[PDB]
Amino acid sequence: LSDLINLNLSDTTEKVIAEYIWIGGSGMDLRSKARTLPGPVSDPSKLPKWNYDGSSTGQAPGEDSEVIIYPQAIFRDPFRRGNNILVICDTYTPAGEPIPTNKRHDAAKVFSHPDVVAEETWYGIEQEYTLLQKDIQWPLGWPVGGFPGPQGPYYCGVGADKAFGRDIVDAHYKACLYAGINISGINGEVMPGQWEFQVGPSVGISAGDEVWAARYILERITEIAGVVVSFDPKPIQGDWNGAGAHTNYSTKSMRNDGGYEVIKTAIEKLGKRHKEHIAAYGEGNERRLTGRHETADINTFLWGVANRGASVRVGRDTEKAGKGYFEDRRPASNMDPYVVTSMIADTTILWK
Amino acid sequence: LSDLINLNLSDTTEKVIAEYIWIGGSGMDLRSKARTLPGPVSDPSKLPKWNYDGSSTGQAPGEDSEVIIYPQAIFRDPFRRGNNILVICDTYTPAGEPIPTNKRHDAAKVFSHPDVVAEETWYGIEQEYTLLQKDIQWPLGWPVGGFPGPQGPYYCGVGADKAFGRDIVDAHYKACLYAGINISGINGEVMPGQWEFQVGPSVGISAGDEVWAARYILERITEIAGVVVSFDPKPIQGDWNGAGAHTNYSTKSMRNDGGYEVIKTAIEKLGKRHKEHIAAYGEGNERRLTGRHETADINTFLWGVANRGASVRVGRDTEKAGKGYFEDRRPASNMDPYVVTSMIADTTILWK
Amino acid sequence: LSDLINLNLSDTTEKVIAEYIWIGGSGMDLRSKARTLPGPVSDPSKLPKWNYDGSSTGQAPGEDSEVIIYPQAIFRDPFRRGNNILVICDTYTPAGEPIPTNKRHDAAKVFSHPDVVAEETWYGIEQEYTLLQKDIQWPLGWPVGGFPGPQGPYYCGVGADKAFGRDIVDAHYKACLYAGINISGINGEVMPGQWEFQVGPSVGISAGDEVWAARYILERITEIAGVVVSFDPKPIQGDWNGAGAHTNYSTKSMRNDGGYEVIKTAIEKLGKRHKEHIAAYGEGNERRLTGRHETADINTFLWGVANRGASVRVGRDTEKAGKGYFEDRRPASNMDPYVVTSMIADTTILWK
Amino acid sequence: LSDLINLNLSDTTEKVIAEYIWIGGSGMDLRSKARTLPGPVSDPSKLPKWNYDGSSTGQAPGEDSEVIIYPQAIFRDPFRRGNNILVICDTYTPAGEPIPTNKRHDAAKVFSHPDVVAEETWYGIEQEYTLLQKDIQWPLGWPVGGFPGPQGPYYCGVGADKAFGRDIVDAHYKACLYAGINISGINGEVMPGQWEFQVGPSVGISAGDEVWAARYILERITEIAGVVVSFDPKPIQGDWNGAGAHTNYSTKSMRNDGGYEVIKTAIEKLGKRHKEHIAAYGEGNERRLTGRHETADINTFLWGVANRGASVRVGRDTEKAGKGYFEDRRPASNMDPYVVTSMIADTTILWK
Amino acid sequence: LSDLINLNLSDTTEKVIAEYIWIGGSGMDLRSKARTLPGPVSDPSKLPKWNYDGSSTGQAPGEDSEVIIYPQAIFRDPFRRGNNILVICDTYTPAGEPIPTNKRHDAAKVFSHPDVVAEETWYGIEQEYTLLQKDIQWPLGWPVGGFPGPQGPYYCGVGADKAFGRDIVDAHYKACLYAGINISGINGEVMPGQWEFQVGPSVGISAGDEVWAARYILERITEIAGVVVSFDPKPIQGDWNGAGAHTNYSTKSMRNDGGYEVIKTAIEKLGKRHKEHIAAYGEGNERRLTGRHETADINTFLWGVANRGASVRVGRDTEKAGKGYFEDRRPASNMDPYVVTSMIADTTILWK
């Protein structure tokens, strides 16, 4: 079936294949479908819109199930290659308003303000995932109906005993680099069969545009290998760690001289908003964040510099030179990056 | 056996391989066989006619079973590549008349009229299919003697849990783009293991040819993988949807200013012919069309703009701008594109 | 999943993938993780440092688990190709001191002296490994719950009966040559499924780098083949021989006329320090070194010219010409090249 | 192994093996082991007291892990047969006070009250369970990673595709009838692989004993079949009915003419105690009792004559004849029969 | 094969097969063969002697490999049944002196001392063993290259996933009860696949004999199941409890009223002999006895009333009533019962 999937269409025609991708009803799964266009295009403004049956996804009533999707971001296709592209789309109503599942409209509204634009907000998102076997929700390298050895050799270890699913991870890393996602590294986590990828400094809404892209690519890659991928914080319970997502924030004021006071003020503003942020960081965070294995408490807001378990973590270089980034470690691995980045920018700058 | 199937003959010889393809006795299955020609040919007029045994297919008596096949359409071969071609042929009688299974003669006669030629009728065909396991007529991704999970995630799903047979679909999409079929996109449908492909705006009789070509190509790609493909309107019964085929009609007068009145008149003329069209859209359509959750019914004719369950569906933008096209949703997935295109053209224009 | 792992990124971007590699808590296992850099880099001085969680490895307390890793050596990447690199790193403390597991600091301190720099010392390290089946601890090619034939045909055997896991060995040899490790040959040892590779003459701390590189590569290669690799001296007990590592030492004075007296003086200095060297060559080397068939013994120090069962072995051409190297055969196969090379250089030259 | 498990020791010796069974720390798991006795015995008061280690079960601290075992009931041994017996036992501290997980002490105190003794109380317990595959915890007859057909054919089914695990049910029914349990019927429930059994009319505390023996037998029989039994109320989520256990209750005053008034008064007495009863009758019952199909809800208490959603139901025959029992449908499959029976007796007979 | 193994020879002939069992060179393994005898016999002194090849076992030099076999105890054959018997034997040199591996001679001399004979010593033995898979030496019910769940559910478990290999335990229990062994209980230990059995109160040397016979039966039963028995103290390293045996000891003076003073004097006498006792009670016991969970240590001798970590424990009953036995928890599962019983008798009754 190869020699047909990997067939170069630029030798015989100029038509391109576009991949319209949107978010399903639950707010965590991705839906996509392809089309053909007369020629190459790289500006999202001049791409046609679509519609789809919202009843089949859970985002529209029965009588008028037409749901409109608008192209928003363009990346290079790492599966079809050539001149084909992936389109990260946003979903509206035929009247013209976003559906309640749509969250990029609010994010674009927040990031479009002159203040946030002048602040040059930069976000870096670290995301876990767990590779499970297909039919039984049992992670890779775990024997069927059997636990693996105790933790300790699975964190960045090399060998057939410790690295489970490294082919998928290397393929995902090269595919995300090829497509255009600003990926900044990979590593293996303490749980066996659990890995991590980081989307590096990316400005504004573009951040949320590409991390959502990476997930899509990752899932599709696993579809080739017959493996399930879970971003759920707690796929396995017991003495095994959870999966979470970390956010690195860097405004222009922080990177300049005297930015430590800016960081302190931003963290103080983030404080007293702990409950709303926790309630908007994604379902399942209750089980992941309980204090085990140096994890931040759900009901307490404390920030440190050297402690691994804290709400907000500030590095040594930032404490020394008084400038840099700061890291929030509360968001769960099944979050919505649009929401998290939006309200972080809201609390830091817009809020008074 | 590779390195021999994928062997380039253009480095050693000028001879080409042609694939004569025709429709079998049942009117739904395809038959084909290959031959060798001295050099490249691109015009269907200068291709030699061929013959076959009608008794082995079910289209001729015992005494004189020879059936003549006339080359009609030429496409590029996506399996042999090089300068080889696929020939979409038509079946006649040695005396000179079409056999009762032949339907392209009537369509060509209708489309050859000056009125239909001057009106630039364009058709678009949406075709459903289902991927079943080989020995047991049981769809892909369904456990043997076991139903899959409830519907809802399989419509455009991405993970390994949702997309079944995606490699065949991508191969078919690229192969049809390579050959020359004006394919316009693909997607996955609500039933697991069920997919869709659109043949885009194509003018006149060529439309029909293209559709059949695509089907042939799919029928071959599946047999590389070891999967059965069914266009039957209802392969699996219960709370599972059925495969279907949609048609999009657009004449020149509809495409111009004041075309909404033309669309209304055409739909009015299509009405009162409901029973004949229903009886001429494909066996098994009774089991698919049942009024399930506001969908088309066999015994009732309805048309609307947002109610997608009507017999005739007209888009919102087409109504508000007047110009555009319209869509008929009654034809079954085992139809004959010649017949439906001919009937639509005759009712809209030729009929008084 | 190929066509994505083996995807050339130099055709679309300038960014490189770097592989930071360090030594885990036990002093014998290797941990690694990757990142992306804006462009190509070849000097280790101008590479950024990292940090990692020492708690997950066993090299830091609970409260402040951050362990800093400094790039030290650069090699080409034999798995990613292109402009990607492997970085052999060294572990420190955020205060600035090496952790007790760090051994390259001492080695660099010893090799940075003017005396050792002026007197060029070259080291060659022979390393033996065993290939075992994955889930069981049973060596490759042995039957499950059964022993192979008696020894004698497995030393450099050619047929399918004697060469077990040769594909891994050939791949490792080619990959180590490609990356830049100064490899100098391979062979198969007397035990079936056991092999050996030589890292050739390389000067100073560089040796301790590239050996640790080769091991990493080897282990990663086994991940592709689903095989476990063991450098443990005695993976199998009975009448089956053990795995060891040998060190060829040659300073500048030994390479010149009258160097036999230098070799004799160096061996005299190395003697009477048997206990410390043995205790620093590994823990549990008594199992491999017993004295069977006149081999080396732990409690006794001996040196000869042809007695293979001696602590120090001197080749025939060396006393024939009075110049050359000498071979120490005490270190175990799970040694630390930093420590061994440091002790040999310190005893030979620095000590009085 | 067999012909030794089925070995008649009465031909050779007069000693008898006694099997002691107690309830573990979780309050719903059963532990048991074996003892050798000089001769046959039928009186539980003639059986010696005994002990076990509470640390290994979760019932005592490390300093005092000794937990004493008091024989309370005797049945026949169905697996060893002959003169060997099963003993149902109670758990006590070395000092003489029952441990917190002990619940038969309070029930025996309640059932020894002169009013309860003279009222001749009769219970019948309807207990449902689910059979699961050993490794993957997927119900019996369910394809791995799939679902069976919709509900409706499995209730009291007879075919090979409708009754899944009737061998285990037949073996358990015969074994409980041979041991001495009053088991009064079995059938297959609506879900595949789910069954129930009825422990018939047993007076007072004895009822709670028999059920705690019946469960034991079931478990061991599943151990012979390599299947896992589950008394969890809702093992599978979706449109699949759960497993809840009910209790029919009657008293001598209810067996007399005009007892419908007494049944009514007991019904109001059991009412307005819904909170404590639901709290003490099993956790995890919220998933089972939701309100679907007009059934019982946790937050609402309902009693009627024909409504199948009633928390407490009274049959037509009770109204007609004027006397009988009434059925409590509140508890789940994972109850403790002791607390249920004792609470019903308290809230009906003695508590004012 | 069967229906011939279970063949009754009493219907046809009067000859009886006698099975001779002895202890091999390693001091732990058992060897055995079969002999044909003219008729039934029940007295060990009426049985002929054997001789066997000590070279093939590891007990005699090549020039004199003849080792004489002395019958000592007689039990019934559980595998051949009928009138066939098992014989426990003693090993001797041709001249007449015992071989070094013989240990029953010294215990027989000790137990024939008039004071020991008059004291009528009573012993009980607690033997714990582990069942392993045949080829890979991984415990029963453990996934290959994996681990089961944490400890806690397996102690005296009943389910299919908690008790592993209970068929072997049942067969062994009934076979030992039919043979004539005083076996007084079985249960499942905390580790999966690990069990124990208690050899009950047997007077003097006879105790040890029975234990050996018991071991023999166990091994042969495992041979039927294709499983490997292991009496090694610590087969699996990690957070898994080992297999250590125990010995309860009583004397007529201890059973007499006011015997707690005698028990205390015996405990004091057994104290300060810890070095010799630990040396002679099994090697490889260092791994089992470390000090975890406040247990016994090799370098610490402790005796108490309730501390479960005591080397010699005394129950509450022997303090309340003042009469009873005491339990030595020092020896491992691979003891020789002869030497343990003999030294316990010596250091209490005759040694001053």
Residue numbers in the entry:
A (entry chain F), B (entry chain G), C (entry chain H), D (entry chain D), E (entry chain C): 4 to 355
Task: Pull verbatim passages from the article behind this deposition.
Decades of studies have established a striking notion that all three classes of GS enzymes, despite of dramatic differences in amino acid sequences and protein sizes, share quaternary geometry in dihedral symmetry assembled with two oligomeric rings. Considering that the active sites of GS are located at the clefts formed between two neighboring protomers within the same ring and distal to the ring-ring interface, each isolated GS subcomplex ring holds multiple integral catalytic sites.
MALS analysis shows the GSII from Glycine max being largely a homogeneous decamer in solution. To elucidate the detailed mechanism of how the interactions between two GSII pentameric rings remotely trigger enzymatic activity, we next employed single-particle cryo-EM imaging technique and first determined the structures of GmGSβ2 decamer, as well as that of the CsGSIb that adopts decameric configuration (thereafter named as CsGSIbDec). The active sites of GmGSβ2, CsGSIbDec are structurally highly similar to each other, as well as to that of the maize GSII, suggesting the catalysis mechanisms of these plant GSIIs are essentially identical. The overall buried inter-ring surfaces for both GmGSβ2 and CsGSIbDec amount to ~2000 Å2, that is approximately only 400 Å2 per individual monomer–monomer interaction. This highlights the weakness of the inter-ring contacts, characteristic of type II GS.
